[PDB]
Amino acid sequence: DKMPDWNIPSLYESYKNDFRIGVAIPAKCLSNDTDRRMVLKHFNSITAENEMKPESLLAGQTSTGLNYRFSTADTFVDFANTNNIGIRGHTLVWHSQTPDWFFKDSSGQRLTKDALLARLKQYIYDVVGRYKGKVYAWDVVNEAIDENQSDGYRRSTWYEICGPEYIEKAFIWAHEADPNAKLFYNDYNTEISKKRDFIYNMVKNLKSKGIPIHGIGMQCHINVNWPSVSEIENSIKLFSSIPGIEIHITELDMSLYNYGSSENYSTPPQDLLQKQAQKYKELFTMLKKYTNVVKCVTFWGLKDDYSWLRSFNGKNDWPLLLFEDYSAKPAYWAVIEAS
Prior knowledge:
By secondary structure, the protein is α/β, with parallel strands linked by helices.
């Protein structure tokens, strides 16, 4: 019952003078002929949905250091390179997607600050080094801010062991490993003002002291009701005021539900699909005002049944531009209209 249309306007071509248009995909897409063709029709950037996270690249440790498993990640990078498209690296440093043993020595004892920083340098040098010249943008540090803390730093094991210097050092080391990669700090809830402020000050302070951070990634996991496009625009305006900082919209999707809502639909309500289309049109019209700083917009999934939101929230959802049968949604046509 697949109904892909190979002749409708290409998303990336429609935005070719504005910014790259990207998609997150899991490994299975790379061995599915329909998925591969749809990716290459519409997108000129990809992100590995999970296959380049620390838990995915780490295979284990010994007393002399880390062991890796790169076979699947290599397929992603090779796919992007051979097809003349970008691949964004997701992600070098992230509290929630790293195994607990990474923060311990080979005997099971929690690493000291000095030993963990040494392991961070090793990890970044090895991973960024393997893909040197091949990954145009890395999310070097992901989700290091927690606006419920007075100093704004998430109390992850990284922070508990190292203090905040793990962040700046990750950027220094990634830039040494590939001086031509664009290096990003990536986060969600950038439209919560207190969190936006912590992110802004952290990145600005890194940049002012010479840390090689080149961009802010705004995940933009949004919904049809929140945040407003104007609040997203407020974030772009503030972050873009830092000299030398570009912006990638890294994980865009738009749930049909309010956050924390018990609504649960078996099929997508048309009124909500229409609100979704209206808001996507508004969003892309706004983003087109900022092409001097917004350089890439990636959607977090190819089509609605591939969305991480279905498993995460335990219910059907329709957050993307293509339906389960590969056909175009009202949201697709709205994004084309905004171009």
